[PDB]
Design a protein around this ligand. Structure first.
Ligand SMILES: CCNCCOc1ccc([C@@H]2c3ccc(O)cc3CC3(CC3)N2C(=O)c2ccccc2)cc1
Ligand SMILES: CCNCCOc1ccc([C@@H]2c3ccc(O)cc3CC3(CC3)N2C(=O)c2ccccc2)cc1
Lengths: 221, 235
């Protein structure tokens, strides 16, 4: 039924689902504490992405396990667009590359690319939902049915992105060029997340399946 | 940047490297103990061909030597991997490292960390199969990896980066043209383009895991100066 939404209805839903900007509460203690509070709101966001809560709870958790760090990063990048050379983790926590620096420079470069492209908010929220759905889709009959559903939702977000660029009055050549540019930034965000996740796992901190499930607040029947 | 889409596809098809073979050395038959040695030799021989393929990707040799090396240092494992997945597409459940080196998932449960990567490779092969990926699309995807993977990692640098994005846009055009010319609708074109490019996030993911597996041998990774030597040919 979420697959009957129009592109306009898909955009409004995603804009309405957007999480709040949190405030910061040892730089590394503060970043971890900020991440942990953001995760809760990301779970609330995820449930409002059309199509997501039609999946089993088991597969929602898996998507969330695979994607949460990418989602944290693209949001960091989004809200840093307007602050060249700085990362706005929170309104009370702007850091530059002087205050690890490899991932920091990668984040800054992503924010610079979003600036060069004049990434719009409507496009940004489509990109987050693609990240949520795409990041774990490579990992039974029921499993196969779920991946079919995920790809249908992915296709409709692609339709939506294109719709926005049409509305913006880009030519069809510019639409598919810009679509491609945006999706290629997602492979760099995947790269950035791989580095963080290796770092967390090295600690021997990564949100467990049970913690994510608890946050999803499953229905009681 | 002057080429048509047909011309782009023509050049990429023409530059395709050969399918290489694992050694048929009788003094070194296949066993689980000889495996990473055979696989390493094969990759080392493929890298040589990959260098000379890269130089034939339109736009690539327009870059500085320094940047060409940086792009290859970022992308070589992803390019090996996508070549592997393409070779394996028509053999469900198996990875076709070479025509004489076709492995299944339990042959992979020899080394620690290996089965996990094997399954991601097999999943990618599965995805190619159900998308019925075409050869002409494959070569576009491989060239996007080459140009894209190191680009996010100075006046000359700003010109380099402008140039790389203009070549990516041309490849994007070429991909759409391929799909247009087959007969896909505009909707199907944009949906397929998106499907194809999202696979590149997984390939990056796999390359990071594989890169993590390779350093876990502590032997293997081509250094920056080694790659530069390979690309820095005389005339
Ligand atoms: C839920 C798991 N709990 C265990 C903590 O895992 C964490 C801990 C910290 C981060 C922060 C964080 C916080 C908020 C944000 O919006 C974004 C980020 C982005 C991020 C890069 C990834 N990060 C860093 O510090 C950083 C920045 C620059 C270079 C190297 C590292 C994310 C996840
Ligand atoms: C040029 C750099 N020096 C050489 C050392 O790096 C190497 C050593 C070995 C491989 C093989 C290899 C060979 C050929 C191929 O086409 C592709 C691959 C793919 C690959 C994943 C990476 N691999 C493995 O064994 C493997 C497979 C599954 C799960 C875990 C590991 C590649 C690179």
């Amino acid at each position: 039924l979420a697959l009957s939404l129009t592109a306009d209805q898909m955009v409004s839903a995603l804009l309405d689902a957007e999480p709040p900007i949190l405030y910061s509460e040892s730089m590394m203690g503060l970043l971890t504490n900020l991440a942990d509070r953001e995760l809760v709101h990301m779970i609330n966001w995820a449930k409002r992405v059309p199509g997501f809560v039609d999946l089993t709870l088991h597969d929602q958790v898996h998507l969330l396990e695979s994607a949460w760090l990418e989602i944290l990063m693209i949001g960091l990048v989004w809200r840093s667009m307007e602050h060249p050379g700085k990362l706005l983790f929170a309104p009370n926590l702007l850091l530059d590359r002087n205050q690890m620096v490899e991932i920091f420079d990668m984040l800054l470069a992503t924010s610079s690319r979003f600036r060069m492209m004049n990434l719009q908010g409507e496009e940004f929220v489509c990109l987050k939902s693609i990240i949520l759905l795409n990041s774990g889709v490579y990992t039974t009959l029921k499993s196969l049915e779920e991946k079919d559903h995920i790809h249908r939702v992915l296709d409709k977000i692609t339709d939506t992105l294109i719709h926005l660029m049409a509305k913006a009055g880009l030519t069809l050549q510019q639409q598919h060029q810009r679509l491609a540019q945006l999706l290629l930034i997602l492979s760099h965000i995947r790269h950035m997340s791989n580095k963080g996740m290796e770092h967390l796992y090295s600690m021997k901190v990564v949100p467990s399946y049970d913690l994510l499930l608890e946050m999803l607040d499953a229905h009681r029947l």
